[PDB]
C-alpha cells in the first residue's frame, strides 16, 4: 500500500473564515454518515439531469468546492496532531469516521483559523495504526489538495511508459467500451476509495492509460484515424452539447510508443471548468492514480499562485521537478478540429463551422458563470464557485505546449 | 490462583507438582496466530479484527507444496509430549508409590 | 534528568562511524568450522564451572544461532560434556557435505550468503535433508543483496523456508542454548530474555519498502511488530515475537514483546556508556521500535515505558550506573523494577509511527534512510561529553560543606527534617577509654 | 481477539448497541449498562476431542 | 530375506522398513524432497532416491 | 531464604517502597500475614492493614475497627483479637 | 420500588436488606445496640434504630 501522504489546505480569498454555511454541512456531509466517498454521489451523466444551474451550489464543480472548504475546517490532526472543534462541531471518535455537534461535558479545543495549512502523515500516528479503516481519508485528501495547488482548474498529471498495455489493462477496457466518461470517473473514484491497494496493481495501470488516452484525444491527437492500441475517446457534437465523451475501438492505425517515457503536471487556465463535466471527471480520475501511488515528482512552481510557491513535499524549483502545463478549452478546441482536418477526418469547411459552434457553446459557459459569480459574491461568506476575473476567460496559456507534449507523447 | 499467576510462590518443597504443572501450563499453551482471507477488492464484513483478516488459537502455516507427512514439531505435537511426560511423572511421584 | 525510576547523566555519547558489512569466504568458513576447538569460535559458554567440566548456558555465533532445534531436543537437554562432543561431530560432517559438492580450489574465493548457509546448517543438525539450499550457496554481492539473491525463486523452499517475490519468511535462531540442569529461578543465571526456546519469534526480511507496507498489513492483527532501524545486519526485516510470556523475570509483568524491547534498551545504554571516536560500530542505535498495535497515549505497562525511554536513548544518553556485560536475572529484575517504578514519562522527544526524531546537537549521525529525522525539543538539558564510571567504595564516605548564597528560615528547615529523618535511631557505643 | 494467560486482557464482554447513550445522557455510564451482551456457550466433550 | 531376492533396490528397502517404524524417536534425512521418512519403504525403487 | 525472598516480592508488588518507607507496620498483623504465608494461605486480607499510625492509636485499636471473623485463625471483636500463640 | 411508597423509613429498609444479603461477605458494624447486621431489614421501622 502507501502508508503516508502529504497535504494542503485551501486558501481564502481575503475573506477571514472558511467559506462554507452550515447548511451545507448538514447538507453536504450531514446525517452522521460517513463523508469520505461522496464525491460522486451528487453527478451524473450529464448536466441536463442536475439541478446545476440555480439556487444553492449553482455549477458543475460547486458542491465538490464546498467539499474541499470544509475539509480545511476538520484537518487540524495532521496539522497539530489533535482533534479539535469548529463552530461546535467535531469529529465523533479519533478515527474520525463522522462529525457530530461538540458534546457538553469534555469539549475538544476550538480550533485556530489558518488557511493554506500543510499536512503529514506523520504528525497523526493513531492513523497509520488504522490505515485498513482509515484509508479513504488519503483519497480525498490528496484531491482536496490537488485543487487548493491552483486557482482556475485543478491540477492532475499524466503519463505514459515507453511499453505497450498489459493484456490485463486490454481486457478490462474491452469491458468499457460504451461507457460515457462520467461513469467511468466514478469507478475510478470508486476503485481506490474504499480500501488499500499496491500501486502494482492491474487497476493502477488501467486507469493511468485511460487518462494518457483521454487527454490525447482531447487534444486531437488520438482519433479514429489513429489511435492507442485500438482505443480512443469519441467527443459530443459542439452543435448540441460538446460537453461528453466516450470510450471507442477501432481497426485505426495504433500509434506508436514514445521514444522516451513522457509525463506532466495538467490543469485547466480558464473558468470555463467550474461548469464543464469532462473536465471535472477527467481530473478527478487523473487525481486517482496519484491518490493511491503518490506524486511522483514535486511540482513546478514557475507558474502557480502564490501561496503554492515552495510548498514543502508537494512544489519545487530544483532538478527533479516536472514542468506543469495549462491549456483553454477554446483554443484546445481549435487544435482539435484543425488536427481532424489534417487527418483528413473532415473538411476545411466544417472545421470552420466546429470553431464557430464551440466558440458559441463556450460564451454561454462564460455568461452563466459571470451572472453566476455576482449572484454569490465571495463576501457572503460561502464560496460556491471560485472566483475569477472576466479577462481570465481570455487566456490561451500554454495550449501550445499542451499539444506538443501530445505530439510527442503519442508518436 | 495467585500461584497460577506467578509460579514462584509456590516453595517446591512443598507442592513440586503443582508448580511443575503451572510452570508447563505456562510455557507450552499454544501461542494464537493470524491468516487472511476473502479479497480485498471486494472488501469485508469485519468488526474488530482488521478486515479480510481471521485470528487463529494456534500457530498455522501456508500450506504445504508436496506431498503431506505426519510431523512431531508441530504446536499441538509439542503439546502433547510434554503434557503425557508430565502425567508419567505424576505416576512415579511418591504420593501413589505407597498405594 | 530521570525516567520513571531510571536515573540519567547529563552528558551524551555515542560513537561517530559505522561498520560495513562484509560477506563470508568460503573457505574461510570451512577454517572456523575446521577450528581444532570451537567453543570461543563458533559458541561460547557463559556460566563454565572449572571445579566441575560444566556449564548451563551457551551463546551461539553466526554460522550456529540460526539453529532452531526440534523439540526432542529443547525437552531433553544433554550436558556440556555430551554438546561439544556432539558439536564437533556436526561441524566435521557439515564440513564433508559442503566440500564434496563445490571442491574448495575452484569456489574459495565464492561469498556465500549468509541467510542460507544459516537455514542450510540449521536443519543439518536438525537431522533434515539440506539438497535445495546448497544449489544457492553463493551470491555476488556486487551484483544485489543476499535478500535479492534469494527472491529469484518466489515460492515455498521448504516447510521452514518461505520466500516469495519481495519477502522472506523463516523462524528466529536461537541465540542462546541451555544445557542440562538449567535454572532461571537461581537469580545468579545468566539471563536469555526467553531467546532459548525454539520459536520466540519470526523474521520477515524484504527488499523494498512497499514489501515492508504489504507485511505489515497483514501482521496488524497480531501482537507487537519490531524492527529496527539502524543497521539491519544481513538486511531490512522485521520481526513478530511470540504472543506469550516467560517466566521469573519479574511478578508476571512481562510479555515476549516487551522483554526483546527492554534488552534492547540496556544494550543501546551499554553501547553510549562505552562507545568511543576511535572506534567504528555496526550499529549506533541499538533499541527496536514498535510498529503495529501500540499506544502512544499511555504508559503503564512495560512495553510502552521501555519505548518512551528508548525514543530517548538513540540521542546518546547514559545511565548514572553502569550494566553488567552478561547480566543475570537479578540484574534485569532491577532494572525491570525501577522502569516500572512510579514517575514522570519523559515527552522531549514524540513517538512516532514508523520515524525517529533526533536532536541535532546529539553526537548520533543518522543514516541515509528516510527513517530519521532532526527534531528541537524546547528545554533539552543534556550536553555532549563523556563520562566515566567509578567503583564502589567499600566505607562509608565523608563530605566538607559548601555553600551557595540561598538561604532558608528555621521553620523551613526543620519541618524539612521532620519527615525525612529516622527520629528514633538505634545506634552503639562503642569504647570510650 | 484470541487473548492468551493475560489476566487484564480477558474479555468478559462483547455488546452491542441500538441507541446513541449520548442521547440518553448515559456518556459517563458502565458500557455494560448501556449495550446490550451476547450469552452462548456450548458443553463440548474431552472424550471426543482426545 | 533380503539378499535372495534380485532385485537391486532390496538394500534401501530393507532399511527404510525399520526406518518407518522408528519415524518417532530417531529422525533421518531424505534426500529428494516430497518423500518422508514415514513413506511406505516399498516405493523407495529408483537408485536417485536412496 | 526462598520464603523470606518470595514474602518479600509480594510486600512490594503492593506499596511501593518510594511511598511507603516510612509508614510503620503493626506487629500483630506482620505476625499472622507472614506465618500464614509459609503456611502456604492466602494472605490478601491482612495486606489492607500491615500499617497504622503509632500517635494516633494502639496496634490492637487499630485492628478493633474491623470487629468480624477475619480468617479461621484471626478473630477480633469490637475490644478484643483472638489467635494461637506461635 | 422504593421512592414509590410513602413510608420515610422506606430508604433504611432497602439499604438494610441489601445489608442482610451481605453479611458474611461484607460485614460491618451496626452501630444500633439490639440490632445486628441479619436482624429482618423490614423491622427497621423506627428513627433511632438507623
Known amino acids: ?411 | 490462583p495467585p500461584g497460577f499467576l506467578n509460579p514462584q510462590l509456590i516453595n517446591p518443597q512443598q507442592a513440586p507438582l503443582l508448580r511443575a504443572f503451572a510452570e508447563h501450563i505456562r510455557a507450552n499453551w499454544p501461542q494464537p496466530s493470524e491468516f487472511g482471507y476473502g479479497s480485498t477488492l471486494q472488501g469485508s464484513a469485519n468488526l474488530f479484527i482488521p478486515p479480510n483478516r481471521m485470528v487463529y488459537p494456534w500457530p498455522n502455516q501456508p500450506l504445504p507444496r508436496l506431498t503431506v507427512a505426519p510431523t512431531y514439531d508441530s504446536a499441538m505435537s509439542n503439546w502433547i509430549s510434554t503434557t503425557i511426560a508430565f502425567f508419567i511423572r505424576v505416576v512415579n511421584s511418591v504420593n501413589m508409590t505407597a498405594t | 534528568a530521570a525516567v520513571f525510576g531510571i536515573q540519567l547523566v547529563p552528558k551524551l555519547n555515542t560513537s561517530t562511524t559505522r561498520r560495513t558489512f562484509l560477506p563470508l569466504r568460503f573457505d574461510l568458513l570451512l577454517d572456523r568450522l575446521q577450528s581444532t576447538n570451537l567453543h570461543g569460535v563458533l559458541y561460547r559458554a557463559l556460566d563454565f564451572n572449572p571445579v566441575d567440566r560444566s556449564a548451563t548456558v551457551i551463546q551461539t555465533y553466526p554460522p550456529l544461532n540460526a539453529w532452531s532445534p526440534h523439540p526432542a531436543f529443547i525437552e531433553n537437554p544433554l550436558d556440556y560434556r555430551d554438546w561439544t562432543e556432539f558439536i564437533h561431530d556436526r561441524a566435521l560432517a557439515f564440513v564433508g557435505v559442503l566440500t564434496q559438492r563445490y571442491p574448495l580450489t575452484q569456489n574459495a574465493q565464492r561469498y556465500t550468503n549468509p541467510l542460507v548457509l544459516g537455514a542450510a546448517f540449521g536443519d543439518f543438525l536438525n537431522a533434515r535433508s539440506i539438497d535445495i539450499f546448497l544449489d544457492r550457496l553463493f551470491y555476488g554481492p556486487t551484483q544485489e543483496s543476499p535478500i535479492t539473491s534469494i527472491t529469484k525463486f518466489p515460492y515455498q523452499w521448504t516447510i521452514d523456508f518461505n520466500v516469495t517475490a519481495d519477502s522472506v519468511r523463516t523462524p528466529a535462531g536461537c541465540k542462546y542454548i541451555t544445557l542440562y540442569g538449567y535454572d532461571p529461578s537461581r537469580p545468579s543465571t545468566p539471563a536469555t530474555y526467553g531467546k532459548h526456546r525454539p520459536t520466540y519469534a519470526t523474521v520477515f526480511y524484504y527488499s523494498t519498502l512497499p514489501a515492508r507496507s504489504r507485511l505489515l498489513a497483514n501482521l496488524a492483527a497480531g501482537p507487537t511488530v519490531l524492527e529496527h532501524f539502524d543497521s539491519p545486519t544481513y538486511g531490512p526485516h522485521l520481526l513478530l515475537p511470540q504472543t506469550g510470556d516467560v517466566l521469573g523475570y519479574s511478578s508476571s509483568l512481562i510479555s515476549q514483546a516487551a522483554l526483546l524491547m527492554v534488552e534492547s534498551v540496556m544494550d543501546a545504554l551499554r553501547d553510549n556508556a562505552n562507545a568511543s571516536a576511535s572506534t567504528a560500530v555496526t550499529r549506533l542505535d541499538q533499541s527496536y521500535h514498535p510498529v503495529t498495535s501500540f499506544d502512544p497515549s499511555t504508559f503503564n505497562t512495560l512495553l510502552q515505558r521501555a519505548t518512551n525511554l528508548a525514543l530517548l536513548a538513540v540521542q546518546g544518553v547514559q545511565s548514572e550506573s553502569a550494566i553488567p556485560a552478561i547480566p543475570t536475572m537479578s540484574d534485569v529484575r532491577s532494572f525491570v523494577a525501577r522502569l516500572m517504578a512510579e514517575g514522570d514519562p519523559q515527552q522531549w522527544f514524540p513517538y512516532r509511527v514508523d520515524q525517529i526524531l533526533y536532536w541535532p546537537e546529539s553526537p548520533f549521525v543518522p543514516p541515509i534512510g528516510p527513517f530519521y529525522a532532526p527534531f528541537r525539543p524546547v528545554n533539552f538539558p543534556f550536553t555532549t561529553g563523556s563520562y566515566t564510571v567509578v567503583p564502589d567504595a567499600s566505607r562509608p564516605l565523608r563530605l566538607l560543606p559548601q555553600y551557595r548564597n540561598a538561604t532558608i528560615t528555621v521553620q523551613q528547615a526543620d519541618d524539612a527534617y521532620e519527615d525525612t529523618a529516622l527520629s528514633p535511631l538505634i545506634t552503639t557505643h562503642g569504647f570510650c577509654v | 481477539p484470541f487473548t492468551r494467560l493475560v489476566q487484564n486482557d480477558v474479555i468478559t464482554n462483547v455488546l452491542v448497541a441500538r441507541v446513541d447513550p449520548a442521547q440518553r445522557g448515559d456518556a459517563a455510564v458502565d458500557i455494560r449498562a448501556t449495550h446490550a451482551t451476547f450469552a452462548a456457550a456450548l458443553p463440548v466433550d474431552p472424550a471426543a476431542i482426545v | 530375506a533380503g539378499p535372495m531376492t534380485s532385485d537391486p533396490h532390496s538394500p534401501v528397502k530393507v532399511f527404510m522398513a525399520l526406518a518407518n517404524l522408528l519415524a518417532q524417536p530417531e529422525p533421518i534425512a531424505i534426500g529428494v524432497p516430497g518423500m518422508h521418512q514415514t513413506t511406505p519403504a516399498s516405493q523407495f525403487s529408483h537408485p536417485g532416491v536412496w
Not at chain 1, 514543502?312 to 478546441?333: E, F, I, R, S
Request: include cysteine; charge should be neutral.
Open chain 1, 1 to 411: 500500500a502507501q502508508r503516508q501522504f502529504f497535504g494542503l489546505t485551501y486558501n481564502f480569498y481575503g475573506q477571514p473564515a472558511p467559506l462554507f454555511d452550515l447548511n451545507d454541512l448538514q447538507e453536504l456531509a450531514g446525517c452522521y454518515a460517513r463523508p469520505w466517498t461522496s464525491r460522486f454521489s451528487h453527478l451524473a451523466i450529464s448536466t441536463g439531469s442536475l439541478p446545476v444551474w440555480s439556487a444553492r451550489y449553482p455549477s458543475v464543480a460547486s458542491r465538490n468546492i464546498i467539499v474541499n472548504t470544509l475539509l480545511g475546517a476538520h484537518l487540524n490532526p495532521f496539522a497539530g496532531g489533535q482533534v479539535t472543534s469548529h463552530q461546535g462541531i467535531t469529529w465523533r471518535d479519533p478515527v474520525l469516521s463522522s462529525l457530530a455537534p461538540v458534546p457538553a461535558i469534555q469539549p475538544p479545543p476550538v480550533w485556530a483559523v489558518a488557511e493554506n495549512v500543510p499536512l503529514d502523515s506523520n504528525n497523526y500516528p493513531t492513523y497509520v495504526l488504522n490505515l485498513s479503516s482509515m484509508w479513504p481519508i488519503n483519497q480525498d485528501v490528496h484531491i482536496m489538495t490537488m485543487w487548493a495547488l491552483s486557482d482556475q482548474g485543478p491540477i492532475y498529471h499524466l503519463e505514459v511508459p515507453v511499453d505497450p498495455m498489459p493484456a490485463a489493462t486490454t481486457a478490462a477496457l474491452m469491458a468499457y467500451i460504451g461507457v460515457p466518461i462520467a461513469h467511468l470517473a466514478q469507478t475510478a473514484y470508486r476503485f481506490a476509495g474504499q480500501l488499500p491497494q499496491s500501486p502494482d496493481s492491474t487497476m493502477v495501470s488501467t486507469i493511468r492509460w485511460l487518462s494518457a488516452i483521454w487527454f490525447g484525444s482531447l487534444t486531437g491527437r488520438l482519433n479514429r484515424s489513429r489511435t492507442c492500441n485500438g482505443f480512443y475517446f469519441e467527443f459530443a457534437k459542439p452543435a448540441l452539447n460538446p460537453d461528453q465523451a466516450v470510450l471507442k475501438w477501432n481497426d485505426g492505425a495504433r500509434a506508436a510508443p514514445p521514444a522516451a517515457a513522457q509525463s506532466s503536471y495538467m490543469r485547466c487556465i480558464s473558468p470555463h471548468w467550474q461548469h464543464q463535466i469532462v473536465e471535472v471527471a477527467g481530473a478527478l480520475m487523473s487525481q486517482s492514480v496519484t491518490a493511491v501511488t503518490g506524486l511522483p515528482a514535486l511540482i513546478d512552481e514557475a507558474t502557480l499562485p502564490a501561496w503554492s510557491q515552495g510548498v514543502a513535499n508537494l512544489t519545487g524549483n530544483g532538478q527533479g521537478v516536472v514542468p506543469c502545463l495549462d491549456y483553454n478549452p477554446v483554443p484546445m478546441a481549435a487544435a482539435r478540429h484543425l488536427q481532424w482536418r489534417q487527418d483528413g477526418l473532415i473538411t476545411a469547411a466544417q472545421e470552420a463551422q466546429l470553431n464557430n459552434d464551440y466558440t458559441a457553446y463556450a460564451l454561454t459557459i462564460e455568461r452563466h458563470l459571470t451572472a453566476m459569480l455576482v449572484a454569490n459574491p465571495i463576501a457572503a461568506g460561502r464560496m460556491p464557485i471560485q472566483p475569477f476575473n472576466a479577462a481570465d476567460f481570455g487566456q490561451a496559456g500554454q495550449t501550445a505546449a499542451a499539444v506538443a507534449l501530445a505530439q510527442a507523447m503519442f508518436v
